[PDB]
Symmetry: C2
Subunit: 455 residues, 2 copies
């Protein structure tokens, strides 16, 4: 099939996630055909640096023939059996055992899903069920954040803080609340980041006291806000959030769907920020996106509460899917046994973070250069000295993203935030190759800015 | 690993869907290891007739080496790329094109998910977005049915009518309503099924007038209620439901997650019952459960409304997953090209339905023997002449299910309904083998009933 033919069929038959379908069907979809390591090829033969690892998820990179063999072997033996009929199967038991080896102490039990969105919905029902079992049926509100992202289920979209999502489906659903995000560049006023971290965390205490602690089930947050634009909270933030949750007997939930499976150099983002959640949600890196699988990692407190409650009337046909479980097992064993996570912490993470800051700090219209391990970002700004953002936040980001894409580099615009999360296996040479393209793209971005009198 | 070892690890580490974890961890999980055609083997070497095709989904049966090859080939070439970044990939374009060939007229466009539950959430947001685009932001309530099942997302569980699910998570969410199910055995009084069908459909008109048509977005139903116990509505029901929806400007949605991909002998259950939905939800048979994938099939009217609305701020990381798409393609091509769906309509379906009625009609405590194509059921009853059900509806079904399972036959109890949905490829010999075991099991069931003084 030609590029033209694939585009014709895509436009005629396919509705995409988070897309202006009318626009895409006219402009034509870019057809990605092949992946190897950190690179993609499109139908026009372009070699592309995937600085987003598929969608924050292809943590071991493309081309794992060993994962394809594990999928083939399991699909030939038992492609599917359900976990509903007082039944199990070896692939799901083996994965559950391996996950207990790599997760923090106290995380013995896992509930399986297909997606991060299903994991968040599962976590919401688990949190509410937990408090019902404790004899507190009033304790049902989950608190999230504006510009937080917790997936695209009605439940996940509700707990997320994307107004563009809320306005499609009449969200949020009841028993959801939101506090402002710990975005120092915009909300920091004359505070230091560390001062601001305590203030941004105390917005949770304010919201708890407004609602009433007796009605608040949980606080949920991404250790680093992903889709919101790699919002890295100050070092003082998570310890204050945790103090507040424990003071008011509110459960603390990490959304690890991006930060999980080595993205920060720790196995999990909550380990990097030094907080101890009761539950955490996972997908993406769990299987390096090779097959759909998500999980809720359930701490001892909530697991004992759920087990005390008899039936949990929840789950998905494909929960624990043997083939997805077999591939996730291969993926997690690789992340440990090949030293991929340890390499992010001790080697490629510090290299990426140093080189990221070296590359982007000098630009007139770049600020808040940031990152941890193998997640990094910056913001395109009208004026650094004034911390002044561009109007129509997102228009300038789209301009920059389109320049990257034209130059066969994938980095994502989140409003006017530019973000990167490449495969964890990226080499030092590949980091420098990626930053060389990004640097030339920013030089062109700045030229165009001044040319249009936008600078 | 031994049976004992698998059970120890499962109990220590795995939380199952729709399970009493405390009970399962004591009793021990049955470990399914291998599948071939209509049979499973457990860790103790028992050969099992899978009369439920995994979970209503393994439509082409176990052992498709060609599906494992398609998965391996795609996973080696491009295991994952996202459909979010104005991007596509061959596997998703090819599947989208093939689906348009096999789906009813007007269904050109498909939105992908991982699960039936995600497909239902997608459909809810699509229906609400549609009415917003039409300038009717009041038009947001979806009506389902008591004992309807639409998955295990917060959205799907809300639209579903399982009270045991509603009581876990504070459901239903707003803009959800429910009417009684068209269950003639319980609600039929001295009406004929056809008389009852019109009355049960008019419950929808009554509910619409109670709420106000201006507030009602859609009516959603499974053509045949699956998890509710294969509730087969009268022939008069769906045409009346459709008349009522069109009269009041309400969208009509088929949940095809079980009935889809040949289960009734039609490609889709709505075709068998003769109604024209605006959207339908799918999973299970879409890939014969070989990998997780679901879809919303969007009719011309709702697709034009969504496309008119610019951005649809919805979707999942693994929407359109290349490897799942490659396997679904192989599955759908097999269902068509190997004549599997046609064979249900013209050959094995009528054989199953005749043999099912021949086998179960004679039993003193069996009634409402029913089915079409390769979905069939009956109800365990205290007294046929009185249409008297057993008290604690579900206790007697569990007794019967446990006898089946002990005799290496998988049939599911839905309350006191016994249901079957085996692989569509089941032979006449395999139908007779399955019914011979079920028959001997019902003889034992009746003995035990009387022994316990429950009869
Ligand atoms: C923190 C967090 N929590 C949950 C989800 C939902 O997982 P999926 O339902 O498997 O998509 C995501 C995913 C975000 C994107 O889809 C994206 O990358 O734009 C996430 O980052
Ligand atoms: C009509 C209908 N609509 C939606 C779903 C949800 O799909 P998944 O999210 O893929 O589980 C189901 C599934 C039912 C079962 O899980 C079961 O068979 O017990 C369904 O039958
Ligand atoms: Na290569
Ligand atoms: Na630890
Ligand atoms: Na710990
Ligand atoms: Na509303
Ligand atoms: Na400041
Ligand atoms: Na997103
Ligand atoms: Na640390
Ligand atoms: Na650290
Ligand atoms: Na390696
Ligand atoms: Na170290
Ligand atoms: Na540089
Ligand atoms: Na603005
Ligand atoms: Na045994
Ligand atoms: Na290859
Ligand atoms: Na076609
Ligand atoms: Na059709
Ligand atoms: Na047709
Ligand atoms: Na149509
Ligand atoms: Na019910
Ligand atoms: Na409302
Ligand atoms: Na509402
Ligand atoms: Na009833
Ligand atoms: Na009578
Ligand atoms: Na009414
Ligand atoms: Na169910
Ligand atoms: Na009439
Ligand atoms: Na009208
Ligand atoms: Na082919
Ligand atoms: Na074909
Ligand atoms: Na074939
Ligand atoms: Na054909
Ligand atoms: Na065949
Ligand atoms: Na026929
Ligand atoms: Na009677
Ligand atoms: Na029992
Ligand atoms: Na029993
Ligand atoms: Na056979
Ligand atoms: Na037998
Ligand atoms: Na009798």
């Amino acid at each position: 099939r030609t590029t033209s033919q694939w585009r014709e069929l895509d436009a005629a038959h396919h509705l995409h996630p988070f897309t202006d379908t009318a626009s895409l069907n006219q402009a034509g979809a870019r057809v990605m055909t092949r992946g190897e390591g950190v690179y993609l090829w499109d139908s026009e033969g372009n070699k592309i640096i995937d600085g987003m690892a598929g969608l924050w998820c292809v943590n071991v990179g493309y081309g794992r023939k060993d994962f394809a063999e594990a999928a083939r072997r399991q699909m030939e033996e038992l492609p599917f059996y359900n976990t509903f009929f007082k039944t199990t199967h070896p692939a799901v038991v083996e994965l559950s055992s391996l996950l207990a080896e790599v997760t923090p102490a106290g995380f013995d039990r896992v509930f399986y899903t297909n997606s991060g969105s299903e994991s968040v919905d599962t976590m919401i029902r688990m949190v509410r069920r937990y408090w019902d079992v404790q004899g507190k049926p009033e304790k049902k509100t989950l608190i999230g954040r504006w510009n937080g992202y917790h997936g695209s289920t009605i439940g996940g979209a509700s707990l997320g803080g994307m107004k563009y999502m809320h306005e499609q489906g009449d969200l949020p659903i009841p028993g959801m609340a939101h506090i402002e995000q710990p975005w120092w560049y915009k909300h920091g006023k004359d505070m230091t980041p560390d001062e601001f971290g305590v203030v941004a965390a105390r917005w949770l205490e304010e919201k708890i006291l407004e609602i009433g602690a007796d009605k608040v089930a949980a606080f949920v947050g991404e250790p680093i806000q992903g889709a919101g634009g790699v919002i890295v909270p100050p070092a003082t933030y998570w310890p204050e959030i945790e103090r507040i949750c424990r003071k008011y007997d509110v459960l603390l939930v990490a959304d690890e769907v991006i930060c999980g499976f080595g993205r920060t150099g720790e196995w999990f983002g909550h380990q990097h920020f030094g907080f101890q959640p009761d539950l955490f949600t996972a997908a993406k890196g769990l299987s390096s996106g090779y097959l759909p699988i998500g999980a809720v990692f359930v701490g001892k407190r909530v697991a004992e509460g759920l087990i005390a409650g008899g039936d949990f009337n929840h789950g998905f046909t494909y929960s624990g899917h043997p083939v997805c479980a077999a591939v996730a097992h291969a993926n997690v064993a690789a992340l440990r046994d090949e030293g991929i996570v340890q390499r992010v912490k001790d080697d490629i993470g510090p290299y990426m973070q140093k080189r990221w800051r070296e590359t982007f700090s000098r630009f007139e219209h770049v600020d808040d250069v940031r990152g941890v391990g193998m997640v990094q970002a910056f913001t395109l700004v009208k004026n650094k000295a004034k911390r002044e953002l561009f109007p129509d936040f997102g228009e300038i980001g789209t301009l920059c993203r389109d320049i990257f894409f034209r130059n066969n580099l994938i980095m994502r615009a989140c409003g006017d935030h530019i973000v990167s999360a490449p495969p964890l296996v990226m080499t030092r040479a590949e980091v420098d190759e990626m930053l060389a393209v990004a640097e030339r793209c920013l030089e062109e971005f700045e030229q165009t800015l001044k040319a249009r009198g936008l600078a």
